[PDB]
């Protein structure tokens, strides 16, 4: 028996444009999923799916390799499902987050959300992937 814990960071930044875009978009924002502190999550992460509001074109954005991030311009905040799929050949194959992509009016915004995943009795190949990315076997 064996249990592994590994950390992901979800974040975004948002800046109020000095000049809005032609469509009237007031902000530049960027959303990402990364490993903390030098850790590389590509070892166990197969792809990240960012589901953008359907006002955006091709709202289902996919990154299959780092950096796992979406850069965009818009005018309001919105709820953004985020799927992180794993390099696993058994369940669980993905985790889903509900991310609040919010913009403020005062100008500069940075947000960071620290998530912790636990995998119970992973295969030994997947376990190696987890640890190479900064994971932790536990009680």
């Amino acid at each position: 028996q064996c249990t592994v814990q590994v950390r992901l960071e979800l974040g975004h930044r948002a800046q109020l444009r000095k000049k809005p875009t032609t469509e009237g978009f007031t902000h530049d924002w960027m959303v990402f999923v990364r490993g903390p502190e030098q850790c590389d999550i590509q070892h166990f992460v197969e792809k990240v799916v960012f589901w953008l509001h359907d006002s955006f074109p091709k709202p289902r954005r996919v990154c299959k390799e780092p950096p796992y991030k979406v850069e965009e311009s818009g005018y309001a905040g919105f709820i953004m499902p985020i799927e992180v799929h794993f390099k696993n050949k058994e369940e669980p194959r993905k985790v889903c987050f509900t991310y609040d992509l919010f913009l403020n009016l005062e100008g500069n915004l940075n947000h960071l959300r620290c998530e912790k995943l636990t995998f119970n009795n992973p295969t030994t190949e997947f376990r190696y992937k987890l640890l190479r990315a900064g994971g932790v076997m536990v009680m």
Binding site: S55, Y75, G77, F78, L103, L105
Partner: peptide, 4 residues
């Protein structure tokens, strides 16, 4: 803050 604006929302959609």
């Amino acid at each position: 803050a604006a929302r959609k």
